[PDB]
Amino acid sequence: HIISPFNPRYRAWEMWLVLLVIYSAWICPFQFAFITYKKDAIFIIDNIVNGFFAIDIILTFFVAYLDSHSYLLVDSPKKIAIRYLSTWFAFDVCSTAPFQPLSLLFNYELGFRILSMLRLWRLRRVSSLFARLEKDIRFNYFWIRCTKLISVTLFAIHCAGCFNYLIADRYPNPRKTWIGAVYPNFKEASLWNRYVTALYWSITTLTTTGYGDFHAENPREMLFDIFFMMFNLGLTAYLIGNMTNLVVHWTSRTRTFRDSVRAASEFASRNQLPHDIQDQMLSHICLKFKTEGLKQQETLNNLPKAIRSSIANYLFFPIVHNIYLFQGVSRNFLFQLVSDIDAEYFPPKEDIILQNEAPTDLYILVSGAVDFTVYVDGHDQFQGKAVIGETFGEVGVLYYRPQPFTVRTTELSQILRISRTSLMSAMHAHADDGRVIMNNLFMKLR
Amino acid sequence: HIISPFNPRYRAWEMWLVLLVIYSAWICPFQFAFITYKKDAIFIIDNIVNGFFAIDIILTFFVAYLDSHSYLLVDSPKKIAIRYLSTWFAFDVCSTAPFQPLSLLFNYELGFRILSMLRLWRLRRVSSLFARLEKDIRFNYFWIRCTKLISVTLFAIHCAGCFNYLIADRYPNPRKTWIGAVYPNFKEASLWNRYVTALYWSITTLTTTGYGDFHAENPREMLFDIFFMMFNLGLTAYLIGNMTNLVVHWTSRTRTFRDSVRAASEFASRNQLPHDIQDQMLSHICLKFKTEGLKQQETLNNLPKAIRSSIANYLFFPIVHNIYLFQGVSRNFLFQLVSDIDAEYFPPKEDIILQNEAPTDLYILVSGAVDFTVYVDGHDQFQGKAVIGETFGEVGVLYYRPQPFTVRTTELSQILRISRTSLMSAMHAHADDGRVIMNNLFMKLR
Amino acid sequence: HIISPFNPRYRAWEMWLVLLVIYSAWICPFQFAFITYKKDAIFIIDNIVNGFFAIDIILTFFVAYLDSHSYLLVDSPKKIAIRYLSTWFAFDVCSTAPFQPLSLLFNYELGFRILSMLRLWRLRRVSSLFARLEKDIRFNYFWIRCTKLISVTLFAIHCAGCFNYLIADRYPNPRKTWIGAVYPNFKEASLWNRYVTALYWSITTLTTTGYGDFHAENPREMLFDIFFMMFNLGLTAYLIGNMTNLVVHWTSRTRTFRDSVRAASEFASRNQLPHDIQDQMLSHICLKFKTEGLKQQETLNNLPKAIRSSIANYLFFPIVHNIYLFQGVSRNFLFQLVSDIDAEYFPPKEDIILQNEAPTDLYILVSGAVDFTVYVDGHDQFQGKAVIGETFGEVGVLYYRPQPFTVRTTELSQILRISRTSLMSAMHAHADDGRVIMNNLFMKLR
Amino acid sequence: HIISPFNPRYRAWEMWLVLLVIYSAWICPFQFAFITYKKDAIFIIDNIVNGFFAIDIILTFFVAYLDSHSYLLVDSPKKIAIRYLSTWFAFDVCSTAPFQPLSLLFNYELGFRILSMLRLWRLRRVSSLFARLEKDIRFNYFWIRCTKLISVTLFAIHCAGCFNYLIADRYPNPRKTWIGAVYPNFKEASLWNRYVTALYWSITTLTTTGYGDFHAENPREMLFDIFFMMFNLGLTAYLIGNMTNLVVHWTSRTRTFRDSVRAASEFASRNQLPHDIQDQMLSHICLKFKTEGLKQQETLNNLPKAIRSSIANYLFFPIVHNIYLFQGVSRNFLFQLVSDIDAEYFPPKEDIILQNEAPTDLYILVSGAVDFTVYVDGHDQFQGKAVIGETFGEVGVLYYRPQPFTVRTTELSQILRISRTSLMSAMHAHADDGRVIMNNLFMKLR
Ligand SMILES: CCCCCCCCCCCCCC(=O)O[C@@H](COC(=O)CCCCCCCC)COP(=O)(O)O
Ligand SMILES: CCCCCCCCCCCCCC(=O)O[C@@H](COC(=O)CCCCCCCC)COP(=O)(O)O
Ligand SMILES: CCCCCCCCCCCCCC(=O)O[C@@H](COC(=O)CCCCCCCC)COP(=O)(O)O
Ligand SMILES: CCCCCCCCCCCCCC(=O)O[C@@H](COC(=O)CCCCCCCC)COP(=O)(O)O
Ligand SMILES: CC(C)CCC[C@@H](C)[C@H]1CC[C@H]2[C@@H]3CC[C@@H]4C[C@@H](O)CC[C@]4(C)[C@H]3CC[C@]12C
């Protein structure tokens, strides 16, 4: 018996009202200044529009809302009328109520047009849409906000141009007005010439060009220009502020990358490192930026540490499920195993593990070739290998001994890292470490 | 015997002085240029205003202040005169002292008007108010500062317009001035036409429109325009800077939210997660933003860790006071218990606790339904439940064993979390853990 | 059989195309408005340019690209045509296709010039270059982006000026146009005068000056100015946003330094420290800023903790290799030793180690003199020394006893710091600590 | 034999050169356009200025500099000539060399004035001063940078005005120039009228007003305005960027404070806390902001942890030196004791320690009254006290028992905090804890 605020009916009703509001807001100054009122072909359409909003006044009592403290619903139509009658009812029933149609049919005009300028309270619904669409996900945020600013700027042009043409009509002596002193016969021309002339006056003093045509002579008009140029100063400052937000935010990523590269280059050229350490640092920052892992670190560390477990369970479980070491290790162990795996990504020709380094982490390959050569003991050649899926670092499992070989990449790779302390934290989950240790003993003895 | 600076008398005295300062600052250029001086109907009011400030000069010796290093008072009127006589006394006694009323009554004028332009030192009190109202809590900060800028801009318009009308009066050959070459008979017109014309000239070169009327011909006036247009360049840059602060600060929250959603969507569409993990991540960020917990985390972690204990004592003590487990647990234990409770809030249909997960935390419900179904062992159906107040996670109290069921939400909930390490930290507070363990044994055996 | 996208041939082919695109984009409005078409001396060059792009349409099928998910190559020409035929093929084959040369040779003009305005789709390659050069390392980032903005601004001036000269030619009554009412005989003048006049009109309404010459009289031209002044408002806001990024980013370092100095001075002058502690704090921040160690800390702590080991191995191994203590300590121990050394840098006259201070760290000198004097026990003189390479702090190795002397610098120095906990972490690497302890015993006994 | 770069002689020599450079840069356009050259009264002064710079060319070989990698000196005049002859020698010896005085005395002019426009290379010294004064401590940073921008803007006005007056002189037909069509007789007027007119033209198109006087008619002049208005667009954007930095940086502190208060108020009014917890949170943030402890925390935690020990040794040693507990505790213990003391500051009426709270820290008063009342057991009244210097929290030294009383402030205080873990860390420093424990036993037994 109560209409939910997420039906397909009510949302299409709102968007039909939004098109109707845009119609009313475009007509109202153009009706206020140029055209007369006694003819009725637009009077019909205005009365129909007032009928639609009078229907909406009734129908907003049947609609549920979303409360702030308790969520997802408010029903039982008490407190709905308390919400609607306190916040938005008074100005809506002032705006919806016809006054010109009663003045026309009762006895009878300028004081009745000002009562028709209250139709602009209907323009809150456009603000409610541009509040919804920023916060909705499935839209470009830097498109909606510039659309909002273009809407406000175009409406300021329109309303100011029509009000100045009004104050040019109502004044005796057509000469010494802004349009009279240039065109001496202007009331006999069409609507398109007068409307384009008013619009052209208004935009040359909004966008602060100000050629020198169409300046003011009438002192009341000379008074209107003071308030309009104050308003244009304020709005132009606001517009430059929004475009500064769009430019600062659109290019933050590339600027932060170039900061990191400048800092690495100053640190390198200060201490005079030869070539190799420079190329390692700069290529490693280039491949941190091509796979943008900084936002990955932040947004993974903002997750509630169970959804990241389901992420790693999707990504790395069939890779860890088939290794040299793990054979029969009881997948209910693997669910608690997988969730601490921290992926990584590595440049080519970066010496990963050097000879006689004290061990720190397991390096399961997921892709990419690896080339191992003797370091210090062997001047050149020798042997060293590992292929997709084939782990290494299995010396420092429990042997606690340094790595035999050198580890230099050939083509780029993706290397998982279950480190030493993570392994020793996995040690207390016993009765399945026996299978791992049997795989170690039968692995190395063969 | 010494007036405190927080009485209701002295604050109303200051605000009466602020209205008097605004009066003096509006009159002084308008008196300096347009009107004469020999008539006395405003001379009376100016002498009365000088009387009020001469009273304030005496009365500021009886008032205490707030020192910088030691707080809350300085009394004993030594060092009050040392403060007042060193900082603000000289220019105040130069501004308050009448010079035109002595020139009028002594013997007698342009050199005496410049001595009346020193009345603008009285305008420090408006700066002191706009320093107080930013730092006071009970006002909108983005309203006060724009009011300050509108005040400075309007006063610049006013003073520049009146000074240019002065330099147009004092020059012989009324033609070849800015107002003379357009209106040849301008000294015979009223005050309102000349004042609106001067104001209209001034605003078309402050807001950089510059139509082309009212340009300068007199070379001294052509010299005045150089300094005024330098000043307008500086002030327009300052105004755009302040509106850039208001726009960058007004929309930081929505922009940060949309950053987080873009980063989550790039991380999802890079690694090709199917649907479910995308919808979990995006709905969890949407419900971190509807209940803005990031500012909560920051401002709770900036608190001195006793007021947050009183906060949690108000919020969660009658909820934890009535549980399945806790029955008679001696509320002086509960005061030390409650202060480490970390609240949270959760989306619907997010799988909270999965089957055979190694346990991490207690999950006391505070609201919201919970639905538990068999995971892996059971393909569908089965049973699992918990209602408002009914805790779960009571397996991993001391049993150290994985959870039996799956835990999927149905409608959204608020779930407290006293985690495993927090429980084991609460273990050393003994002689009341016996009641908890008896409640465990009689709880599970039934 | 497939051309790689990193050959020297294909890159020079692209840059030749970029010069050809700049040629076409400069000619096309200037051809559209001023000159005729029936003559053929430029028609030849345009057909040759269309030939070059028709060659490029074929040749872009033989070129490999870089995929997003898997890197470094895509070969095997399937999916290359799927990439090229879906993204960029349609508008390229619309732009490359000649239509004016077919209109000239088939039967025959304004509707055929608009088909020649589709040559501006060729201007995507300039956007691809200005996307590459920001992300490439070996270029100044704040030079490329301002070059991009100057390019867009100059092209807007050019195209708007030529389009307004077109709409001034095509209108009957040469008077009441923008160039007709000032120059009554303008079609008989040269190209340079008309082109400079159109360019001069366009820039006085792009850069919002607007003198007052050359305003519009024709109502269709009065309509064109509305769209052009809207566009200029948008572009001027965008340009101010980019220069705000350049100014905020160019002076962040000096502003952060001056923040730190202001905060230290307020903390000093609040609590009334006499002189010495002020000069120590301020000179220490000055020598943190002359050797900018903050970016060093950040970019070293962002490194993957093996490249920083190779850095410290290059920088400090021949310094630690020759000390009082270390003599025969088996350089495979030294590789694991060096990587935890944290360098530092110190002001002169800063008291480094005071008398009877509980010990914290080893202080190996690398440069700079050190002067030690008796503290408290000795009023003045006494003795204390250490020279380049000569360590101190060797009391608190295992003696766990306070330092004997005071340590005040004379000229500035660079002092390594292997602290107490780092030494005790190095203790478990035994069978070579015996040599260190023998060097201690024979060191102190002599 | 080598002049140090920090003598009082050489710095005064540099500042005399800076005044001479400002003289040359102001004269050179004004000499280039207005005045003739054959008279000699300024020719003398120009030759003298060239003599001063020819002396400086020699004298810059005797001066030491500061190297980048090794600091504080470079002597031994090899590599000084390598620095000076590579970087700055060529353009200095081109600028210093006279060419007009040789043209005047050799045989003989426009091509020789362009050789005199190379005197503007001498203007690097003003850039070196405005690089030094930002980085020097004893100057306001937001004053120097705005002075730099005003200098560049005024010089742009000056040079552009004089160059346009040149291009107005050199053209035949004095009518159809910018100054000719308004003043038909302008070459017969003085210097002040022509100079003010050129300056007034230049500033109305720098500050984008553009009245409508003084527009261009000569096509070469119409070409000059294009480059000058491009330059003014660029410079106006740069100026707005710098004022945006000054406004964003000048009001960051108050804006951050108001952020914290808004976040605390939203967190309070969301969860509906009654009054007391709101007033505690808001008054505690107000007294974190009146004594700005956030910058204190940052800049103390950036210190090298020995200077902060000397700070706490100056601030708190004679306060801790005289307590209830500590009597004879051997001040060489006190030097290691003091350095971990963390000061704090507290609002009035904030309940500091509640009844039956598990203890956390010692609370030595340094000022401010304290009032203790019974909590829960006692409804009202009771007793509780502590005065300046009199510690409390001495229950939980080793008794590990909750506090007896409640602790509510009356007037604001400053309370040191040596916490529980800091005390237990001080426990291993024995052979003087016996005196503390004797003071405990004789303290409580009395
Ligand atoms: C041709 C006819 C077209 C008709 C269709 C157009 C009708 C759309 C109408 C939408 C209206 C809602 C837009 C809104 O809500 O107003 C923004 C605020 O506007 C300002 O800047 C006002 C600064 C004033 C300048 C100071 C005055 C100086 C004294 C919110 O911006 P926010 O900060 O994002 O919330
Ligand atoms: C019609 C009559 C109305 C009379 C009533 C109005 C009188 C009110 C008067 C209030 C005055 C106090 C306002 C203040 O203190 O001046 C702000 C600073 O102003 C600037 O921008 C000055 C930039 C100059 C531009 C460079 C010059 C270029 C060479 C502080 O701003 P802050 O940074 O927030 O401290
Ligand atoms: C004399 C002849 C010279 C011819 C040579 C010049 C041709 C070069 C041509 C390069 C073009 C690529 C440059 C680009 O891509 O367009 C930037 C975007 O431009 C804007 O600002 C457009 C704002 C519109 C204002 C709103 C309109 C208001 C309704 C990207 O900027 P981004 O943000 O960095 O990506
Ligand atoms: C009346 C006679 C007075 C004579 C005395 C004055 C002589 C002083 C002369 C000082 C000069 C050094 C100042 C400097 O170095 O130039 C700043 C940079 O200037 C710009 O903005 C240039 C933007 C160009 C706009 C693009 C052009 C668009 C195509 C550095 O600013 P920075 O970023 O802080 O380094
Ligand atoms: C002189 C002339 C330029 C005046 C134009 C000013 C407009 C910018 C004014 C006229 C009516 C105003 C609207 C009417 C009230 C609206 C409801 C409010 O919840 C949001 C702002 C809201 C949408 C206003 C925005 C600003 C408007 C559109």
Ligand SMILES: CC(C)CCC[C@@H](C)[C@H]1CC[C@H]2[C@@H]3CC[C@@H]4C[C@@H](O)CC[C@]4(C)[C@H]3CC[C@]12C
């Ligand atoms: C050419 C014309 C536009 C000059 C107007 C400049 C004004 C903006 C000047 C005139 C007098 C100045 C005021 C007088 C001194 C005031 C005391 C000081 O503690 C705060 C600034 C303070 C309030 C000044 C602000 C700027 C004012 C109001």
Ligand SMILES: CC(C)CCC[C@@H](C)[C@H]1CC[C@H]2[C@@H]3CC[C@@H]4C[C@@H](O)CC[C@]4(C)[C@H]3CC[C@]12C
């Ligand atoms: C009224 C007149 C000023 C219009 C000029 C507008 C120009 C600024 C428009 C005209 C053609 C447009 C270009 C054509 C399409 C181009 C491909 C796109 O991938 C990047 C933008 C891209 C390069 C456009 C940038 C903006 C241009 C250059």
Ligand SMILES: CC(C)CCC[C@@H](C)[C@H]1CC[C@H]2[C@@H]3CC[C@@H]4C[C@@H](O)CC[C@]4(C)[C@H]3CC[C@]12C
């Ligand atoms: C059209 C007219 C407005 C041209 C004026 C442009 C000035 C802004 C140019 C003219 C000469 C230029 C100066 C000459 C070279 C100087 C050395 C360099 O290390 C710093 C910039 C440096 C100081 C330049 C700054 C910009 C100046 C002062």
